[PDB]
Amino acid sequence: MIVPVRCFSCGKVVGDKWESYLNLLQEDELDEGTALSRLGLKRYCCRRMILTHVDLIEKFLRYNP
Amino acid sequence: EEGPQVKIREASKDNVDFILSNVDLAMANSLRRVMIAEIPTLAIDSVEVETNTTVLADEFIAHRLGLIPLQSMDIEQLEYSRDCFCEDHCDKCSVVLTLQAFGESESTTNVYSKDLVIVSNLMGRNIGHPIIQDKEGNGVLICKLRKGQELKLTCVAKKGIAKEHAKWGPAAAIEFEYDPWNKLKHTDYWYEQDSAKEWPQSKNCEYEDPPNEGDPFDYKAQADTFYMNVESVGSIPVDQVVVRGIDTLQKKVASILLALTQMDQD
Amino acid sequence: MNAPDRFELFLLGEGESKLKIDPDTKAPNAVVITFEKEDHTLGNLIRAELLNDRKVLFAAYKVEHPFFARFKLRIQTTEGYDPKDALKNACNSIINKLGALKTNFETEWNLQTLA
Amino acid sequence: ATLKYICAECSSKLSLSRTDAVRCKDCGHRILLKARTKRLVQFEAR
Amino acid sequence: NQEDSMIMNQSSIDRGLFRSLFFRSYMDQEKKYGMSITETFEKPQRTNTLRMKHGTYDKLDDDGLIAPGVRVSGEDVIIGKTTPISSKRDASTPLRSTENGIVDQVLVTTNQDGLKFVKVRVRTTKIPQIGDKF
Ligand SMILES: [Zn+2]
Ligand SMILES: [Zn+2]
Ligand SMILES: [Zn+2]
Fold first, then answer.
1. Ligand 2 centre and the CA of B88: distance in Å?
2. Cβ contacts of B107-111, under 8 Å, gap ≥ 24
3. For residues C36-70, b (16+ Cβ closer than 10 Å) or e, as one string?
4. How is domain D1-46 classified at the CATH fold level?
5. Residue contact B64–A15, C-beta within 8 A
6. How many CA atoms lie within 13 A of B122 on its CB side?
7. Helix (H) or strand (E) holding E93
8. Catalytic annotation, pick one of E4, E62, E76, E113
9. Residue B132 to residues B69, B137, E81, E87: CA-CA distances in angstroms?
10. Who among E40, E65, E116 is closest to D34 (CB)?
11. Are strands E82-83 and E20-29 parallel, antiparallel or unpaired?
12. Superfamily (CATH) of domain B1-40+167-266
């Protein structure tokens, strides 16, 4: 369901980091706990944000017209 | 220099750790707040949709577009649509972007904040540039689409502050602390056994002298020296989000005098 | 639905003035100023400063009810000293202190290196 | 230039008028949708 | 926040926090009468009866439906339909008086017995407001 732009809690941009995070996982083979720390997502308000998003949009796209 | 002094600890392009010293808490706070809420900035605020086949519904997208940070260096030379004299809007009060995306790729095509396209004359001024800090430089994945999915809309960014809606806030988190060693006794730690042991010390305990038993209780002890850290989203240079903060607040305190004036005529 | 307009938080509506000063009848030489379209930000500060003019016998402010962007400020001063002035000073002071804080923040900043 | 209705599966602009059968020119799939408006719709951005 | 009520960060609600979508679907068919008497989907008016609604029919095309991008509201008619009886008695469907939003998807099908089957779908985004439950 597409990444949230910015953190509900503190407003700090977060719409870009989606793809980066997803590779710092599949590629760079890192753990979430830090893959996030890497993307600069310091405190939990922003963390809980990425760490939790459920990119449903994909399953959506996969339909048709 | 003369009154309330500063002393920037670390400092970057996105944060500005620093020590506001010899001020009034009220003031430290006033500024603290002004930063979060009343600093002018630009953002998309109207979205005309010509075509959308995405899976995301119109307003869904529209919503996001408002959060995609935009350039706001020279915002202070762009007027508020509401004060400008045009029947609605002009280059004198707004920026106009574009967005057209087509699922050409055989594999999920991506719409990014970079795909925006200013169409209004930026009358020569830093404004309306989809702020990018992305590594590849695409910033803010607006949305995705499949095969023949199309998405054509137009945007119209205007001035506006955080009180009107958050998407105009430039701040986004601000660290604020003071008197790390509870010396003024402005709190009362909860504990099971030992306060000191169970409650972590702050990275700021350093920059201030520890308590030391014996000494009685400093009651006349007020509170100056605040360990702040002003982050930013980009729309404005972290330094500014502090100067303009400092300024904006100043103007408000100003208008109050000016008010006391016209009110003096009668 | 019954939502007030977001901008009403700061745009003075048709025929309202930021300030409005009414003389408190309860005590002598003291007044109540209503600040329209404003909040704690401004209030708490003008209250603090106002709390230094040692010729200011009383000073406090309150936001009537969250729903409404506005607050009342009661200022009581020593004889022969009119509070309107007391408010004036406290205002200026704040400006002056801020200005300093600005020059100074800029000083330190210019003398820095980013990474 | 212009259209009106569409095919739920084999998405293909179609249309017609009264008693023109409610099927598609290929897929019988008797469903059919109605394609957006000419009128451009605007949206608040908050 | 007293008595089981809470305070909710406005800013967060803005940046999104808890917004939702909301669809609803009105539906209609063309009655048939053994002795070939049928209703129709159209944008009527006067023509004897006046037995029609009060909501703008305008948002109505000629198939007696609303284009999918249209913003609807009050009791505008979402579907035009007439019944023959002895000339133009209405049978159109206005939007639920209390709701309002944007037409989202219209669709026209046949129903076994070959009559015109149609369903409209309006969508609304509902942002968390003060009386809301969580
Ligand atoms: Zn955050
Ligand atoms: Zn203009
Ligand atoms: Zn077909």
1. 6
2. B108/A58, B108/A61, B108/B144, B108/B145, B108/B146, B109/B144, B109/B145, B109/B149, B110/B138, B110/B141, B110/B144, B111/B141, B111/B142, B111/B143, B111/B144, B111/B145, B111/B151
3. bbbbbbbbbbbbbbbbebeebbebebebeeeeebb
4. Rubrerythrin, domain 2 (2.20.28)
5. yes
6. 17
7. strand E93-94
8. E4
9. 8, 6, 53, 64
10. E65
11. unpaired
12. RNA polymerase, RBP11-like subunit (3.30.1360.10)
Chain E residues with CB-CB distance to B58 below 8 A? 102
CA gyration radius, chain D: 14
Q: Is E104 annotated as a binding residue?
A: no
What CATH number is given for E20-127 in this structure?
2.40.50.150
Looking at the CA of B83, name the nearest ligand. Answer: 2
Q: Would you call E16 helix, strand, or coil by DSSP?
A: coil
What domain range includes position C31? 1-115
Asked if the Cβ–Cβ distance from A4 to E12 is below 8 Å, we say no
The total domain count for chain A is 1
Q: What is the CA radius of gyration of chain E?
A: 20
To the nearest whole Å, the CA of A29 is away from the closest chain B CA by 19
Rounded Cα distance between C10 and B38, Å, is: 10
Q: Choose the CATH number for B41-166 among 2.170.120.12, 2.60.40.10, 3.40.140.10, 3.30.930.10.
A: 2.170.120.12
Method: X-ray
d(CA B143, CA B54) in angstroms, rounded, equals 8
Cβ contacts of residue D42 below 8 Å, gap of 6+?
B46, B47, B48, B49
Neighbours of chain D (3+ CB pairs under 8 A): A, B, E
| Resolution in angstrom units | 3.7
The structure tokens listed for A32 are 């979430």
**Helix B25-37 and helix B240-262, axial crossing angle in degrees, nearest 10:** 100
Pick the ligand that lies closest to the CA of residue B80.
2
E76 catalytically annotated = no
CATH number of the structural domain spanning residue C58: 3.30.1360.10
| Cβ–Cβ under 8 Å, residues E79 and E65 | yes
Check if the beta carbon of residue C29 is closer than 8 Å to that of residue C77.
yes
Any residues with CB less than 8 A from the CB of E56 and at least 6 apart, and which? E76, E77
Cα of B173 vs centre of ligand 1, distance in Å, is 7
Within the 23-52 window of chain B, which residues sit less than 8 Å (CB to CB) from chain E?
A: 49
Give the residue extent of every domain in chain B. 1-40+167-266, 41-166
Chain E, nearest residue to B49 by Cα: E69
d(CA A8, CA A20): 20
D16/chain B closest Cα distance in angstroms: 23
Ion ligand 1 neighbours, Cβ < 5 Å: A 7, 9-10, 12, 45-46
